[PDB]
Design an enzyme around this catalytic site. Structure first.
Site, short mmCIF file in Angstrom:
data_model
loop_
_atom_site.label_atom_id
_atom_site.label_comp_id
_atom_site.label_asym_id
_atom_site.label_seq_id
_atom_site.Cartn_x
_atom_site.Cartn_y
_atom_site.Cartn_z
N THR A 182 3.97 3.55 -3.95
CA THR A 182 2.72 3.31 -3.06
C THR A 182 1.99 1.93 -3.54
O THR A 182 1.79 1.74 -4.69
CB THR A 182 2.07 4.62 -2.75
OG1 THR A 182 2.91 5.41 -2.25
CG2 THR A 182 0.74 4.06 -1.78
N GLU A 227 4.55 12.49 1.01
CA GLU A 227 5.81 12.79 1.03
C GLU A 227 6.09 12.60 2.65
O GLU A 227 6.61 13.58 3.19
CB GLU A 227 6.07 14.10 0.50
CG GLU A 227 6.04 14.29 -0.79
CD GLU A 227 6.57 13.08 -1.76
OE1 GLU A 227 6.36 13.04 -2.87
OE2 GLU A 227 7.75 12.76 -1.10
N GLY A 282 0.65 9.36 -9.70
CA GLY A 282 0.06 10.41 -10.52
C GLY A 282 0.79 10.04 -12.01
O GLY A 282 1.68 9.86 -12.45
C1 LIG Z 1 -3.63 13.51 -3.71
C2 LIG Z 1 -2.46 12.31 -3.42
C3 LIG Z 1 -1.71 12.09 -4.36
C4 LIG Z 1 -0.72 11.07 -4.16
N1 LIG Z 1 0.18 10.90 -5.06
C5 LIG Z 1 1.25 9.71 -4.90
C6 LIG Z 1 2.38 9.79 -6.25
O1 LIG Z 1 2.31 10.44 -7.13
N2 LIG Z 1 3.08 8.42 -5.92
C7 LIG Z 1 3.14 7.85 -4.84
O2 LIG Z 1 4.07 6.99 -4.78
N3 LIG Z 1 2.10 7.88 -3.82
C8 LIG Z 1 1.14 8.96 -3.91
N4 LIG Z 1 0.07 9.25 -3.01
C9 LIG Z 1 0.19 8.08 -1.73
C10 LIG Z 1 0.99 8.94 -0.62
O3 LIG Z 1 2.36 8.77 -0.77
C11 LIG Z 1 0.69 8.04 0.77
O4 LIG Z 1 -0.84 8.17 0.99
C12 LIG Z 1 1.71 8.31 1.77
O5 LIG Z 1 2.83 7.85 1.86
C13 LIG Z 1 0.92 8.13 3.22
O6 LIG Z 1 0.40 6.47 3.10
P1 LIG Z 1 -0.75 5.99 3.70
O7 LIG Z 1 -1.89 6.77 2.90
O8 LIG Z 1 -0.85 4.49 3.49
O9 LIG Z 1 -0.59 6.01 5.06
P2 LIG Z 1 -1.13 5.23 6.56
O10 LIG Z 1 -0.12 5.36 7.35
O11 LIG Z 1 -1.47 3.79 6.02
O12 LIG Z 1 -2.11 5.94 7.16
C14 LIG Z 1 -1.87 7.22 7.75
C15 LIG Z 1 -2.61 7.14 9.30
O13 LIG Z 1 -1.36 6.22 10.18
C16 LIG Z 1 -0.68 6.80 11.01
N5 LIG Z 1 0.42 6.14 11.13
C17 LIG Z 1 1.25 5.42 10.16
N6 LIG Z 1 2.32 4.96 10.53
C18 LIG Z 1 2.41 5.46 11.64
C19 LIG Z 1 3.61 5.34 12.79
N7 LIG Z 1 4.87 4.58 12.61
N8 LIG Z 1 3.47 5.91 13.93
C20 LIG Z 1 2.26 6.49 14.45
N9 LIG Z 1 1.24 6.76 13.39
C21 LIG Z 1 1.29 6.04 12.24
C22 LIG Z 1 -0.80 8.42 10.61
O14 LIG Z 1 -0.22 9.07 11.77
C23 LIG Z 1 -2.23 8.40 10.07
O15 LIG Z 1 -2.97 8.89 10.98
C24 LIG Z 1 -0.62 10.11 -2.95
C25 LIG Z 1 -1.79 10.48 -2.18
C26 LIG Z 1 -2.76 11.54 -2.21
C27 LIG Z 1 -3.90 11.63 -1.26
#
Ligand SMILES: Cc1cc2nc3c(=O)[nH]c(=O)nc-3n(C[C@H](O)[C@H](O)[C@H](O)COP(=O)(O)OP(=O)(O)OC[C@H]3O[C@@H](n4cnc5c(N)ncnc54)[C@H](O)[C@@H]3O)c2cc1C
Ligand SMILES: Cc1cc2nc3c(=O)[nH]c(=O)nc-3n(C[C@H](O)[C@H](O)[C@H](O)COP(=O)(O)OP(=O)(O)OC[C@H]3O[C@@H](n4cnc5c(N)ncnc54)[C@H](O)[C@@H]3O)c2cc1C
Lengths: 637, 629
Positions: free
Chosen positions: B139, B411, B178
């Site tokens: 990420t 995930e 993490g």
């Molecule tokens: C506690 C915690 C631990 C984590 N640990 C790790 C780790 O160890 N390793 C790692 O790699 N990552 C980690 N992450 C990151 C996590 O993998 C990402 O938050 C996750 O993949 C979602 O990415 P984003 O937050 O950018 O989502 P984004 O998609 O940017 O935003 C989410 C929003 O966008 C909407 N959305 C996005 N795409 C679409 C689509 N195509 N159609 C419709 N709606 C859509 C969703 O529905 C939602 O409302 C962690 C996150 C947290 C909170």
């Protein structure tokens, strides 16, 4: 500002400043609130390190000094109007809770309203510079909802003419009072009054708990913080145990009841008591939901991810229908709750005029509607805040979104001023009472006049949608009443019947309250002077009501209020409103007039410059105080 | 114990032990799990002050200390079975997240399944004595869901024979991994492979970020913790910015693709299944606390004469907690089902049969979103059902909530996941449209009543699923028809599509729960679970009555009977509530709850807890002298 946010503000079809006037009550009100807000903003005495970067102890410490400073400044600025005090306090603590909440909100107000001249000199006056700091201690470890169950005793002693305050058991210990933990040296304690071998119920007593000047606990007194919680880091919620603690007889608040020097116990609706029945939690719910929506929507206009069409570049996530569906109904809800909160304010003022004319007829409904709206709005806002948080994706989870603090700060409102379920059941007692009345031949009035149309629509207009909610409320009340009578007519005790019909009864109160919000929102529209503003709020109003119908389609279908086909039209119209609202989303949230500092959000900043700021934020956080953490040398190296 | 909890246990109509057996898969799994949990409970090396009484820094420190000792202790005890590793690790961290999570779950596993003799020699082996501590960095601040949008580049350098890892923008900086904050000295970085003026997609590289022995960030390497979050205090989620940072060309994982010195380029389901179990477990914990506390807490009244009743006697309290208890069991079963399913399909793949792989991906994505979202809201209901006391960390539910809630976004963000499930459902729909018969859990789409029977309720969910899929399909067509564009049509139907996947998944949970009953040997146990199954099914129909009424699947009169049956079932479940929660076999230590203590002695222990609270290290707080005086 970020090109993306600028694009959104340029597409708005209305002037957001005109909506801000509407929220504050008047253009003048907006100016005054802003003026007061700027007093705190540019005042370094109110500045400090980010709450999230501090330990709990340091958080409480910061809250304390800011509150202490707050008092001195409000005295100096001459801020006495309760509204202005609200704005001032909000700016200083930025929505966060503070250790002088009970001191300023219950302690001084109770003394000003019920204390005698000599009492006020001993307990009210010394508080001007916080020489005395108080709190209100009612709740106990063993009793919160059931007051009559409180165990603290205040036994009168004829020989010495003083009361003996006692916490006989572990459960009797006072538990939760804000400021009771480490701030207050005095506490107004609620106890079961005992004199001449008789218990006369709950009475209030002023009890010093900490020595003046040293703040050490007084003999017989045991006080302390109750521990860390989900939120409220800066609030010293506490416990108080009194070991047959003695206080003068003159420390009892005797405006309504008295205890003669010999131990004899002796014995109205006023503008005075009405100020205590007043609630601000509905507005609190509206505000908290608004803050969350402001953050989530701006961020959604800033965040680009995935794709709608393979040929175009990553769109703003606010372009996704699912994104709009998660947030726009909550934005419409935020506005609905603001209008309801304003309606309640209007009502309190209307009620005082009635009381002044000797008319106490609408008091029963006021108390029921107050308990009902409080539960309805707090529960709805509660869930809505977390949706906003999750709608921000992973970044919403970080304290930089600002949402986890808003949620954690707001959620106990579902407990304040009565457990939500208990409050809904209180609203149901009134609904059943009015139902029985109509049953016996009386025409009823008020928001509940629809009951006159029991026993058991154009889904395109606001009138038809309001009617649909009205009919749904009537239907659920009817279902609860009938089900209640079935248990009663089965020879069961009125109480057992009540319990076995409680789920249904809560649902009736819910339906009743939802109908009230819808009607209030709809009634607001025709009064909007600016046509553009009216048009947008109308779309939000249509969305709030249509969305509620879809959320509980079963209620409307079961009562034959709408047809299955109409439910399909409702669902379709909802999707259509989302896009009609889309171009105004940002400006609608800008209208709430929150300053970045209040929001406490990197993601929701006004300018949309999230990313660069999100990096600085993280680099300045406590774990990066050093490149290598000591745990490395000790356990890894 | 508290006599209020013992009378609740005495009224139980079944033996809780037998349900624990079913939950662990077999009596031997229980005995073995309970053995491990004991290895730890009585081991001083894993004892410490309550997390809630420590600062963020101290929490991280205790986690690091425990994890390091954890690896040593496991190796020495012989624990290698990845299942027994979960149990051990669960006992050690008392349910909390730990800094070596990615190291043991992504670093080693990836190396072990992609590294070469040279790489597994200087990378895998060292991660023995934790000589090396690694993490997986995927990420980026700017991208989480859409990976092909990632910005980190790995430009191969033919001259020096080494890849150049670079973070060109603020948004490209890695974010969240993490263990990436202060724990790892190595990180497998996912980056856009660029060689000989051409980008060939995402590839994994092993890159050292901290100097061994000193842990100093290497030159060109900028690392750090991303700050405080809603939860995850003991986890050093971090960021990584690489400024034209060079690493041996031999540091690329070339298991599937290679890059010779010439620069010539050549040649998920288990985790979701894990989260469904994680959803069941977290929901179970919350329910265990809320229910136990409801049997302990007396308040208000029913009859004027009687003493204050346990709040578990209020219908409203039963309505809040029993449907959630039934959901926890439902989720445990669907999780077991997912396990059986992936094991079976895995066996087919090996024989060249990938006919059920698309459904496996779809079901696994859908159930993950369905169970995590449901359990999420349910954990908060459990907290609020405890009154104000629930808000205090002494209830232990806020930590459970904050720890589990991210499962809804990582995930695969739930809505995106449901959208994937919908893509499959539409395909199946188009397939039956063409005249093909489909198999699997979706065989009901080939068909495009009795509220008082188990079979009728399951059948009701089937039709509700079929109806929502059909509504989405119809709306999708209507849009491609009116808007003449597939991507626009998909977006304008996405809320309906999500709803159809939710309905499909709910049907699966019900069906699985229902098919589980006949397999239960003990009659009393089968009997209680049956009530939970009926509660689960009946509750869902009430919650979304309009879906069933709209589809003429149930009539208004039937909806009424549904609601009446739910209330009746609360009553029938009441006597077994505590025992059903006791069946989960959670130990006080991993529950970290004063209110949910097994013995029910809440109040005395509650005061002790507060007394031990950090703010009471002294009677007067420093802030008094320097500000409030
Ligand atoms: C506690 C915690 C631990 C984590 N640990 C790790 C780790 O160890 N390793 C790692 O790699 N990552 C980690 N992450 C990151 C996590 O993998 C990402 O938050 C996750 O993949 C979602 O990415 P984003 O937050 O950018 O989502 P984004 O998609 O940017 O935003 C989410 C929003 O966008 C909407 N959305 C996005 N795409 C679409 C689509 N195509 N159609 C419709 N709606 C859509 C969703 O529905 C939602 O409302 C962690 C996150 C947290 C909170
Ligand atoms: C952050 C926070 C701050 C607080 N600050 C203060 C303060 O400053 N001063 C103060 O005095 N107190 C304070 N309190 C305590 C608050 O007043 C109590 O939480 C409240 O009165 C409810 O008490 P309880 O939590 O014990 O609820 P209990 O009622 O004991 O238990 C609640 C549960 O029982 C159910 N229930 C109870 N009675 C009934 C009934 N008759 N019918 C149906 N269901 C029922 C509820 O619906 C709920 O599920 C605070 C609490 C919190 C969380």
């Amino acid at each position: 500002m970020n090109p993306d946010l600028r694009k959104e503000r340029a597409s708005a079809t209305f002037n957001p400043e005109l909506i801000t006037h509407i929220l504050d009550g008047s253009p003048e009100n907006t100016r005054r609130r802003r003026e007061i807000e700027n007093l705190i903003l540019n005042d370094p005495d109110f500045q400090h390190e980010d709450y999230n970067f501090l330990t709990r102890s340091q958080r409480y410490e910061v809250a304390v000094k800011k509150s202490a400073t707050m008092v001195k400044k409000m005295r100096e600025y001459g801020i006495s109007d309760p509204e202005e005090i609200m704005w001032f306090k909000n700016s200083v603590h930025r929505g966060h809770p503070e250790p002088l909440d009970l001191h300023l909100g219950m302690f001084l107000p109770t003394l000003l309203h019920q204390a005698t001249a000599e009492q006020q000199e001993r307990f009210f006056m010394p508080a001007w510079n916080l020489e005395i700091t108080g709190t209100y201690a009612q709740t106990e470890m063993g009793h919160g909802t059931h007051l009559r169950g409180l165990e603290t005793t205040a036994t009168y002693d004829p020989k010495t003419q003083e009361f003996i305050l006692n916490s006989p058991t572990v459960t009797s210990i006072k538990w939760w009072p804000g400021g009771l933990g480490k701030t207050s040296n005095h506490a107004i304690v609620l106890a079961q009054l005992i004199t001449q071998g008789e218990c006369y119920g709950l009475h209030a007593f002023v009890v010093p708990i900490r020595e003046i000047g040293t703040h050490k606990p007084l003999p017989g007194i045991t006080v302390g913080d109750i521990g860390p919680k989900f939120g409220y880091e800066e609030m010293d919620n506490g416990y108080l145990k009194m070991d047959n603690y003695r206080i003068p007889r003159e420390n009892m608040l005797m405006k309504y009841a008295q205890v003669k020097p010999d131990g004899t116990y002796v014995k109205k609706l006023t503008y005075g008591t009405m100020v205590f029945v007043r609630s601000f939690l509905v507005g609190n719910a509206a505000q908290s939901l608004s803050k969350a929506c402001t953050i989530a929507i701006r961020y959604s206009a800033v965040r680009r991810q995935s794709e709608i069409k393979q040929s175009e570049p990553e769109p703003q996530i606010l372009d996704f229908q699912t994104q709009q569906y998660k947030l726009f109904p909550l934005l419409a809800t935020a506005y609905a709750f603001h209008f309801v909160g304003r309606y309640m304010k209007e009502t309190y003022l209307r009620i005082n005029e009635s009381i002044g004319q000797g008319d106490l007829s609408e008091l029963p409904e006021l108390h029921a509607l107050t308990a009902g709206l409080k539960a309805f709005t707090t529960w709805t806002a509660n869930a809505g805040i977390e949706e906003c948080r999750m709608a921000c994706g992973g970044h919403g989870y970080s304290h930089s979104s600002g949402i986890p603090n808003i949620y954690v700060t707001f959620t106990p409102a579902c407990t304040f001023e009565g457990e939500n379920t208990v409050m809904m059941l209180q609203t149901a007692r009134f609904l059943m009472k009015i139902y029985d009345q109509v049953r016996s031949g009386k025409l009823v009035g008020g928001m509940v006049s629809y009951l006159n149309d029991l026993p058991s629509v154009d889904i395109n207009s606001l009138e038809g949608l309001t009617e649909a909610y009205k009919l749904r409320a009537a239907r659920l009340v009817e279902i609860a009443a009938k089900n209640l009578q079935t248990h009663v007519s089965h020879r069961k005790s009125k109480e057992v019947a009540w319990n076995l019909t409680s789920v249904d009864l809560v649902r009736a109160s819910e339906a009743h309250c939802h109908y009230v919000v819808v009607k209030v929102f709809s009634d607001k529209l025709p009064k909007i002077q600016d046509k553009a503003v009216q048009a947008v709020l109308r779309n939000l109003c249509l969305l709030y009501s249509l969305y509620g119908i879809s959320q509980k389609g079963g209620d409307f279908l079961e009562g034959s209020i709408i047809t299955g086909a109409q439910l399909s039209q409702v669902n379709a119209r909802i999707l259509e409103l989302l896009t009609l609202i889309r171009p105004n989303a940002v400006a609608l949230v800008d209208a709430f007039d929150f300053k970045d500092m209040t929001l406490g959000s990197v993601l929701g900043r006004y300018d949309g410059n999230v990313y660069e700021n999100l990096f600085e934020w993280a680099k300045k956080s406590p774990l990066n105080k050093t490149e290598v953490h000591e745990s490395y040398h000790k356990h890894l190296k």
